[PDB]
Design a protein around this nucleic acid. Structure first.
Ligand SMILES: [Mg+2]
Ligand SMILES: [Zn+2]
Lengths: 263, 79, 14, 104, 221, 94, 52, 39, 1111
DNA sequence: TATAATGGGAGCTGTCACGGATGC
DNA sequence: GCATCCGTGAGCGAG
């Protein structure tokens, strides 16, 4: 039971469901010492049972409204584990991740297969921990806490910051995910090329594999962190390392549309 | 005995893989009664707990490899 | 089922 | 140690009381004026743990000085607040009740 | 029916009052039992509702103050053809009631909203998913607080182990307790005013280490 | 593509073993701060800056390069993990 | 339809030739979106059988 | 994908499931995608 | 520019008022204009008449009335309160047997009001109520899916009034009536109805081997008041018949016009279906004292005559647009009002007993809470009450003419087969076939047709022309979906001389099925081809050439176009674009013939015939729901004479009264270095320069200052430890001054909240002492501009207590709203489309020098990859370029309606006339043919494009006539090897712009329970790595990169605090621990009575809570 | 705490296909 | 052994 921005309280459905059980337990306790007849005691023990059923798996008998006001079932212990939304598919078999971004994709004709366009401002925040370090070895900040306060407001961005960001990214690669993520090649590791402007520049041949077009298609970026995660990305995951389909043995990156026509 | 992919997916030995699939109210109760131990042989089991998956760069075949320069090589060679 | 309905009939016995 | 196995099994009422740091005998959650956990309530500093790290309910015990120490006035161990995500409690039932998963 | 207690709970709480009445009933009075039972049933139900109908629990006297506040607001709506001001109710609620009191009562009467309240017509989103966790320190915060204990341990090396220990003991960096000067005098072998002197000179040597180095400054917040 | 890659898949029994070797070596160059390297200074991976040429920052980029030259020894159970850790921190203090 | 659309798109359809079309398109559009929920489902089954 | 022998420790199931699953949206005198599911 | 307009088709009736389906339907439900005793008993008048009198004392309803709005429309928007009017209702409490009355006027609260355009206001936020479609109340017979020759009868009431009823013949031949999902012999009912074995053999007996199944039980033929009891106990167990409870449960199931109410529609449907007359919308009658039948026998006679085939007996469609109906804003609200009313009446009968049983006003006998909350429900928290989409005038219109089979009272998504979605032959003239959501909603949400109108029974009607003889009357007959079926109806394309049918055969439809017919057999004729397609679909020129699937984007994508600061109406129009500006208010108009007096940007004043000086203020630069800018621009000058109907001001996007979504740019269709690869698009910087596609968008930020438990929150110029650098633009009161520029991270309004309980870390008590300054009492709470947003501060709205005009939430001290507007130039990542459903992201902005041009230096504005066309099959965009080619040169725009419009022949001729201005100028100017133009006329003829041997002047003409010209390359100076199609095309800047969409995160906010990062741009949170994404990692076998997303990068708390520490320091990343969302699962399971335990390889336990949850 | 009062109230509907259990 | 019941599922983004 927490206080939101407005000061108001927001409580979990499990709390009105536990207070229901507690109440029927503590009235059942009172009735039995008061020596109630068997027709009342029958009743109170039956209700103690649809409190335990509402709590554990609700909707397996009839569904408790939080109040008559919302006909929304109170979300119970079972409801929380099972579902698309359940604790399992939502939380344990996939997560929201820390270093990641999203943008609109735009055609990449110039970049080499293994490369892709990354807007300045995305690359800044994605590598922000690495950049605060690189700002310390080069002189642009006394330390981290100073360097961080320097990047907080947008007029405070120095030219050396940028020329230092280039120093960070060297050799590293990132992952591009267009969803639907249908098969393995729907996430490919590219080496980023910092570009001005606000969108991502995708390489033409991999467009077909991702089922990307630019109708306004958007793609997510993730940053592999460990010196391990890097090796994985750059060796196996690279866009230029997977040129055939795992599905049939046939070439996945093939001359596509303008390119077939050109030739 | 032939069975379809939904039955065989639930029927898998490991119940972390069974219960992340469907009929969780059911998977868990038969698993719980049976006092089922789950060796994490499979991906889903491992992915849940955050453990390194049994495939790729976690595969025990390739997982264990060690790299060393020729300098340090002949160097510890004495004993 | 319907504990209201069943309780009522339990009450209607006396 | 390292984890190679995960076992799931039904817990006897005693195995639960093992897990359980105290009984919630009252439904109330918070107090209406000072929003602080009610005694024996669903949120209780006594049972589940202190709201704020290493600090008992009435302020008498603070900082790190006391790791396993329990206030006499309040009833709250002084330990990392994060125990509130971990510690459990029980409600002791007047009549035994079936677990709908084994019925239905 | 609709007051925050389920039918069956209202019946059970009512039954509990039927029992109170069976023990209090004097048959010599010619009244039929139904007359006397009715009073105790209505009393136990109203106690029950006022007790159990709120997640955030409110005292019984306080409950009916808020209720009286509601009915008075409603009456004033019926009269004014619109919702009343805090001050219009405060008048109609008689002496001792100002706008400030009518307001604070209302805020105290605000019931908590379920975190599971759906967002959008799709089943996909919940309210409590958009609610951040303010308690547990973000990675930034935890990183900063460590770089603080590192920066304080680097600037306390410039002091001798005695004068740095006077400060380490007195501000609570060790064990979490702040010791009075007589105690740092009992531990070191110095008189209480001598440990106030080597605490002041060590704090002063720190001030020069700071004005010269420009390290601890960024922690100004 | 990544340079000499084909020959890097010819070096190993399984492509994911080469990745482990690249990842572990890169962590070693990081820890010892590049001084345990098997590269002679002309073979140094360099980075093009504003100022001029500087050493390539990516310990991975390095490690792949170290590999193509026969300078390095990979395999299973070469040396106990004690010896290896210490003899490298002696040879190259960090 | 017992009668076919005679026009090419270069000629252009008729108000009625057009109408007939939208029957096909509409029933094809709802097929494409309905088997889409089923592909990704089947997909998730296969992943779950064969993960180990 | 490499046109060479498989590298030990490849995750093959998740590969196979995907390879089968990616076209599914395309299965159309036709029994189509449900025939597949039926099987 | 002069407008030449194609096609000879004449429109007998113009388009109906287009917002009529809302405007009219809500006015009918209220009747606020009508004097109280002339109110016709529909809508609001009906709920009162139904719910009253309230029986036992009798409280009776007399009349209702509607007062004036608490606040004018605008005020309601800024102040976050609803646009509404007080409703008072006059009641009289009568005494049973005393005779006494007391008659008082009770105040029923407020009811929401519809604005001029057919929309509502809710809390400062415009909403549209959206019409709903459902199976009409009535009596339907569908073939039993069980057996071929058997049929199930269905009796359907208004959805929440009364149960559905199935009448089946089989298995054994007895009539089975299913209600509340319980099957019993229908026979038993008939006895209760005043039917005996004789009266039944008479009318019903005629059908052999059937009636025999019904009368099988003679034992049931015994008595009405025994059978009533017997049945009552067949419906509910354990409930003693009581003979009172039997009649009250049976009447309240069937005969109570209160509980069971057929559609007023449904009433007619069955009267016509079974050919009987109903007294009321009831099934049966309570006529004293026996139950008398109406509905049941003629539905049973109809079923029995359908079972064994009898001629004249119909199965029904249920997808037919006579068997489906539209519930509009007026009916949809009346319902929620009928439910809010009968709860209030419930509250009456409970208080009609208890209390002073003697002293009761009507005032004290009535509570509005069930009614108030019941309407606030419908408007506020409903599905059919939708946040109004006004991106732009068309968005907001279409939104009104949107139609849902969705919403409570109808279908969900899993529920809709191909049936409901399918285009059904009676969607002709009524619903749009084109404008439907693509993807998951398809065929559920649709737009109403252009000429289509919704009648009193909520069935859709389309206009047709009566044709008598060979002549076509100019009278328009508006026909129900069903009554269209009785006639033969020609197309509007069919030839005419005067009023006469001019062909030997015309094309017509009987019951929607296409057929060729003599001029003698034609009963009616289409009004125009325009009647078939949604308003949106009708804005698409040459649409007769575009494939269906792309036209759907043509329609739907026009709803999306962002209003441009220099906006243009298409050089190629279908003619509606002028009146669409009208019907949904965009433009401003003159009310009577008159003369203009004043001219401002802010206001325009007119003097009429009357002499009355009439002022129209202009709405300037106002923010809309999506943040697009509404401003009306003055279009007339001081002292200009205007007749009634002339334009005084242009809408947000309108060009001299016409609809301007996009601009007309000059586009060449060629692949360009793969920059237009895969539907991407390349741009002359010449658009940026002269401010094409540049558009204005206001965003609104808001901030609250409350009364904390720990003190006040103050909005002040004073923020702890903050440089003047930061406070510079702020005023003295803490609010940013108007007209200041703002960036990301900057302060909009500054605020100080009192700090929490202070445990400054021991590291703080030392640092505090060192620097000598004392820990301030107030944290810095100041609201700032989010990343990637910013602009000019155009307005500030401040509200404190002491407010005469608005309501302030409990505990809330003061509220400030700051308005930040940005003028966005077109850019890369931004999105454009055209009217033909061609759509792309902008990939490259070339300089004007690199840009492909003509013989004269004039460069193209756009490059469009030809590859986009042929798979997409939309050829109208080609014809938009071709005609748009010549309209460039001739200096003219055209009107070419759908399906009757420009044929290529007349266009060709227009190209020939354009060519002469093009070439004949260069020929007079003293310039012959270019040396490249030759090398191209070479390859052109090698392509069969020009006739070899003609002059280059006649070859450039034959090429130009194909709409292709010789295009020179910007970069080389050498030509483009072929001739290329170029010409003016209407292209619009769409809603989705990168400025909005780009986001990237490092570390940040985490949800409470899971510890895992939040989603979405402005809560600032990480992308979802979902089940499908993890499979990718796994397949690649990237183990660590996966363990990262699962551990360090999401909920593994210790791992991520230490991961970030590790990178900062410049160390390699730590070894992940247990994901915190795993410990959430163990403890949820223990909470489920399930012990979960990790284990050793030794089977011995392992603690992942590190000892905190064990004693 | 005393007049007498004694068995609810909602009624939500164009899936669908599946497999495994329960019934005739 | 078939009819028939019940309980189970049904592919990023912004709000
Ligand atoms: Mg796309
Ligand atoms: Zn204490």
């Amino acid at each position: 039971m927490v206080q939101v921005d407005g000061g108001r309280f927001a409580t979990s459905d499990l709390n009105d469901l536990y207070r229901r059980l507690i109440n029927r337990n503590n009235r059942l306790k009172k009735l039995l010492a008061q020596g109630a007849p068997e027709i009342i005691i029958r009743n109170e023990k039956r209700m103690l049972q649809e409190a335990v059923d509402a709590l554990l798996d609700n909707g397996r008998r009839g569904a408790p409204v939080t109040n008559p006001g919302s006909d929304r079932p109170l979300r119970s212990l079972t409801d929380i584990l099972s579902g698309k939304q359940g604790r399992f598919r939502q939380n344990l078999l996939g997560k929201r991740v820390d270093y990641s971004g999203r943008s609109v994709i735009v055609v990449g004709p110039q970049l080499k297969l293994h490369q892709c366009g990354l807007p300045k401002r995305m690359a800044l925040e994605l590598f922000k921990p690495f950049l605060l370090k690189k700002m310390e070895e080069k002189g642009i900040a006394p330390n981290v806490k100073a360097a961080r306060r320097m990047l907080e407001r947008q007029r405070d961005i120095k030219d050396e910051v940028w020329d230092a960001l280039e120093e960070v990214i060297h050799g590293k690669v990132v992952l591009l995910n267009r969803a639907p993520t249908l098969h393995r090649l729907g996430i490919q590791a590219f080496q980023p090329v910092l570009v001005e402007g606000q969108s991502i520049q995708l390489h033409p041949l991999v467009c077909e594999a991702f089922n990307a077009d630019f109708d306004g298609d958007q793609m997510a970026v993730h940053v592999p962190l460990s010196s391990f995660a890097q090796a994985e990305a750059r060796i196996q995951m690279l866009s230029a390392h997977n040129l055939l389909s795992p599905a049939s043995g046939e070439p996945l990156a093939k001359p596509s549309r303008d390119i077939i026509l050109g030739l | 005995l032939l069975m379809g992919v939904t039955k065989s997916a639930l029927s898998t030995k490991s119940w972390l893989s069974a219960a992340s699939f469907q009929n969780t109210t059911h998977v868990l109760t038969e698993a719980a009664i049976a006092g089922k131990k789950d060796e994490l042989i499979g991906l889903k089991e491992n992915v849940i707990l955050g453990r390194l998956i049994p495939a790729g760069t976690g595969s025990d075949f390739v997982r264990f490899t060690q790299v060393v320069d020729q300098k340090t090589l002949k160097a510890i060679e004495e004993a | 089922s319907d504990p209201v309905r069943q309780y009522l009939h339990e009450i209607g016995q006396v | 140690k390292e984890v190679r196995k995960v076992r799931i099994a039904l817990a006897s009422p005693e195995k639960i009381r093992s897990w359980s740091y105290g009984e919630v005998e009252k439904p109330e959650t918070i107090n209406y004026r000072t929003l602080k956990p009610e005694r024996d309530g669903l949120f209780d500093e006594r049972i589940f743990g202190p709201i704020k790290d290493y600090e008992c309910a009435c302020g008498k015990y603070k900082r790190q000085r006391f790791e396993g120490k329990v206030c006499e006035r309040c009833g709250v161990e002084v330990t990392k607040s994060i125990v509130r995500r971990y510690r459990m409690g029980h409600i002791e039932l007047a009549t035994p009740a079936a677990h709908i998963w084994f019925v239905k | 029916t609709g007051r925050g207690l389920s039918f069956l709970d209202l019946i059970q709480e009512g039954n509990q009052g039927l029992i109170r009445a069976v023990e209090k009933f004097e048959y010599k009075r010619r009244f039929k039992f139904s007359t006397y039972a009715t009073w105790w049933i209505r009393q136990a139900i109203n106690r029950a509702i006022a007790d159990q109908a709120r997640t955030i629990r409110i005292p019984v006297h306080m409950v009916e103050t808020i209720n009286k506040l509601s009915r008075t607001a409603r009456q004033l709506q019926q009269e004014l053809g619109r919702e009343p001001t805090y001050e219009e109710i405060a008048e109609a609620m008689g002496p001792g009631w100002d706008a400030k009191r009518v307001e604070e009562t209302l805020k105290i009467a605000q019931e908590p909203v379920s975190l599971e309240t759906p967002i959008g017509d799709e089943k996909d989103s919940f309210y409590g998913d958009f609610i951040p966790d303010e308690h547990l320190p973000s990675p930034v915060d935890a990183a900063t607080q460590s770089l603080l204990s590192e920066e304080l341990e680097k600037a306390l090396s410039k002091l001798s182990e005695r004068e740095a220990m006077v400060l380490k003991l007195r501000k609570g960096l060790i064990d979490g307790r702040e010791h009075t000067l007589e105690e740092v005098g009992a531990f070191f072998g110095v008189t209480r005013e001598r440990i106030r002197q080597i605490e002041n000179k060590a704090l002063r040597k720190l001030k020069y280490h700071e004005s010269r180095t420009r390290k601890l400054r960024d922690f100004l917040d | 593509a990544e340079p000499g890659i084909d020959k890097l898949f010819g070096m190993v029994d399984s492509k994911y073993r080469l990745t482990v070797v690249v990842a572990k070596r890169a962590q070693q160059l990081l820890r010892h701060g590049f001084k345990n390297t098997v590269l002679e200074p002309e073979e140094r991976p360099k980075m093009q800056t504003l100022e001029g040429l500087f050493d390539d920052p990516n310990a991975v980029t390095w490690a792949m390069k170290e590999l193509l030259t026969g300078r390095l020894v990979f395999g299973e159970n070469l040396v106990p993990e004690d010896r290896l850790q210490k003899e490298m921190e002696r040879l190259y203090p960090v | 339809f017992e009668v076919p659309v005679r026009s090419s798109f270069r000629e252009g359809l008729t108000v009625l030739e057009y109408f007939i079309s939208s029957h096909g398109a509409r029933k094809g559009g709802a097929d494409t979106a309905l088997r889409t929920a089923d592909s990704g489902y089947l997909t998730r089954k296969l992943v779950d059988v064969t993960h180990e | 994908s490499m046109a060479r022998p498989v590298s030990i420790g490849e995750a093959v199931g998740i590969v196979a499931a995907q390879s089968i699953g990616e076209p599914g949206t395309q299965l159309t005198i036709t029994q189509g995608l449900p025939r597949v599911i039926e099987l | 520019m002069e407008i030449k307009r194609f096609g000879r088709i004449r429109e007998v009736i113009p388009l109906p008022p287009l917002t009529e389906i809302q405007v009219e339907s809500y006015r009918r439900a209220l009747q606020a204009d009508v004097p109280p005793e002339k109110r016709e008993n529909v809508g609001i008048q009906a709920a009162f008449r139904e719910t009253f009198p309230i029986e036992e004392l009798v409280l009776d309803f007399l009349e209702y009335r509607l007062g004036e709005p608490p606040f004018p429309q605008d005020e309601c928007r800024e102040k976050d309160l609803t646009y509404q009017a007080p409703l008072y209702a006059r009641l009289q409490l009568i005494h049973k047997d005393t005779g006494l009355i007391k008659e008082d006027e009770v105040f029923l609260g407020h009811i929401p009001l519809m604005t001029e355009d057919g929309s509502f206001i809710i809390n400062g936020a415009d909403r549209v109520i959206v019409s709903q479609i459902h199976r009409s109340p009535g009596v339907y017979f569908t073939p039993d899916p069980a057996r071929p020759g058997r049929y199930i009868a269905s009796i359907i009431p208004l959805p929440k009034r009364g149960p559905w009823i199935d009448l089946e013949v089989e298995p054994n031949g007895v009539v089975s009536m299913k209600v509340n999902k319980r099957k019993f012999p229908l026979v038993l009912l008939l006895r209760v109805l005043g039917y005996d074995q004789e009266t039944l053999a008479r009318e019903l007996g005629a059908y052999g081997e059937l009636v025999q199944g019904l009368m099988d039980e003679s034992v049931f033929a015994m008595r009405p008041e025994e059978a009533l009891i017997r049945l009552f106990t067949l419906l509910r167990p354990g409930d003693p018949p009581k003979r009172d409870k039997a009649v009250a449960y049976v009447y309240g199931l069937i005969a109570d016009p209160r509980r069971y109410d057929l559609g007023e529609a449904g009433r007619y449907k069955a009267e016509e279906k079974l050919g009987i007359r109903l007294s009321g919308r009831t099934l049966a009658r309570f006529e004293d004292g026996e139950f008398k039948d109406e509905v049941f026998l003629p539905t049973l006679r109809y079923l029995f005559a359908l079972t064994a085939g009898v001629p004249g007996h119909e199965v029904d469609d249920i997808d037919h647009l006579g068997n489906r109906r539209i519930r509009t804003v007026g009916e949809l609200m009346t319902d929620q009002f009928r439910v809010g009313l009968a709860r209030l009446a419930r509250g009456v009968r409970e208080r009609m007993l208890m209390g002073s049983e003697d002293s009761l006003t009507p005032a004290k006998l009535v509570n509005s809470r069930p009614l108030e909350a019941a309407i606030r429900e419908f408007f506020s928290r409903s599905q059919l009450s939708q946040f109004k989409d006004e991106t732009n005038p068309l968005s907001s219109l279409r939104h009104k003419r949107r139609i849902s089979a969705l919403g409570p009272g109808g279908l969900t998504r899993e529920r809709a087969g191909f049936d409901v979605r399918d285009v059904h032959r009676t969607h002709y003239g009524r619903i749009c076939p084109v404008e439907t959501p693509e993807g998951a909603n398809i065929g559920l949400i649709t737009s109403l047709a252009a000429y289509a109108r919704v009648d009193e029974l909520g069935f859709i009607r389309t206009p047709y022309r009566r044709v008598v003889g060979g002549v076509v009357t100019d009278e328009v007959v508006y026909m129900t979906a069903t009554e269209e079926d009785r006639y033969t109806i020609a197309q509007a394309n069919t030839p005419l001389e005067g009023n006469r049918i001019a062909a030997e055969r015309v094309v017509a439809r009987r019951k929607g099925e296409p057929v060729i017919v003599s001029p003698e057999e034609v009963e009616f004729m289409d009004v125009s081809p325009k009647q078939v397609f949604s308003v949106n679909t009708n804005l698409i020129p040459f649409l007769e050439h575009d494939d269906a699937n792309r036209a759907l984007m043509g329609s739907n994508m026009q709803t999306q176009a962002v209003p441009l600061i220099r906006a243009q109406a298409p050089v190629v129009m279908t003619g509606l674009e002028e009146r669409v500006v009208r019907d949904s208010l965009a433009a401003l108009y003159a009310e009577e013939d008159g003369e203009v007096a004043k001219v401002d940007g802010n206001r325009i004043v007119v003097r009429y015939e009357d002499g009355r000086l009439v002022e129209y203020p202009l709405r300037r630069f106002y923010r809309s729901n999506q943040g697009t800018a509404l401003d009306q621009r003055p279009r007339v000058v001081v002292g200009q004479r205007v007749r009634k109907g002339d334009l005084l001001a242009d809408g947000p996007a309108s060009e001299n009264g016409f609809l301007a979504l996009g601009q007309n740019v000059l586009v060449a269709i060629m692949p360009f270095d793969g920059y237009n690869f895969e539907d991407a698009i390349v741009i002359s910087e010449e658009l940026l320069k002269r401010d094409f596609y540049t558009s204005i968008h206001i965003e609104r930020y808001e901030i609250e200052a409350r009364d904390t438990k720990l003190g006040p929150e103050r909005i002040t110029r004073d923020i702890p430890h903050l440089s003047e650098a930061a406070l510079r633009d702020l005023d003295e009161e803490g609010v940013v001054r108007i007209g200041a520029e703002v960036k990301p991270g900057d302060i909009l309004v500054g605020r100080t909240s009192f700090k929490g309980e202070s445990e400054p870390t021991p590291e703080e008590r030392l640092l505090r002492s060192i620097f000598g300054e004392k820990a301030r009492d107030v944290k810095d709470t100041s609201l700032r501009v989010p990343p990637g947003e910013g602009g000019i501060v155009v307005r500030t709205v401040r509200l404190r207590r002491g407010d005469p005009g608005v309501e302030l939430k409990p505990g809330v001290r003061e509220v400030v709203r700051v308005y930040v507007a940005q003028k966005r130039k077109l850019q890369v990542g931004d999105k454009l489309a055209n009217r033909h459903g061609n759509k792309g992201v902008v990939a490259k902005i070339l300089p004007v020098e690199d840009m492909p041009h003509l013989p004269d230096g004039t460069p193209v504005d756009v490059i469009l990859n030809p590859l986009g066309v042929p798979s997409r099959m939309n050829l109208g965009q080609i014809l938009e370029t071709h005609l748009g080619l010549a309209g460039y040169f001739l200096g003219q725009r055209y009107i070419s309606p759908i399906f009757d419009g420009a044929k290529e022949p007349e266009i060709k001729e227009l190209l020939a006339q354009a060519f002469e201005v093009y070439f004949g100028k260069r020929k007079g100017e003293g310039f012959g043919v270019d040396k490249r133009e030759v090398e191209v006329l070479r390859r052109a003829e090698k392509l069969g494009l020009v006739t070899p041997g003609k002059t280059p002047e006649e070859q450039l003409k034959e090429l130009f006539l194909q709409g292709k010209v010789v295009l020179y390359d910007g970069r080389t100076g050498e030509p483009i090897e072929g001739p290329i199609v170029v010409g003016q095309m209407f292209i619009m800047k769409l809603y989705h712009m990168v400025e909005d969409k780009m986001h990237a995160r490092s570390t940040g906010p985490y949800s409470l329970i899971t510890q895992q990062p939040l989603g979405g741009k402005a809560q600032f949170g990480g992308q979802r790595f979902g089940e499908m994404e993890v499979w990718a990692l796994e397949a690649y076998g990237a183990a660590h990169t996966l363990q990262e997303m699962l551990t360090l990068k999401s909920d593994d708390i210790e791992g991520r605090n230490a991961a970030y520490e590790a990178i900062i320091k410049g160390e390699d990343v730590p070894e992940p621990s247990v994901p915190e969302s795993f410990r959430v699962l163990v403890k949820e399971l223990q909470a489920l009575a399930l012990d979960v335990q990790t284990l050793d390889e030794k089977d011995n336990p392992v603690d992942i809570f590190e000892g905190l949850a064990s004693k």
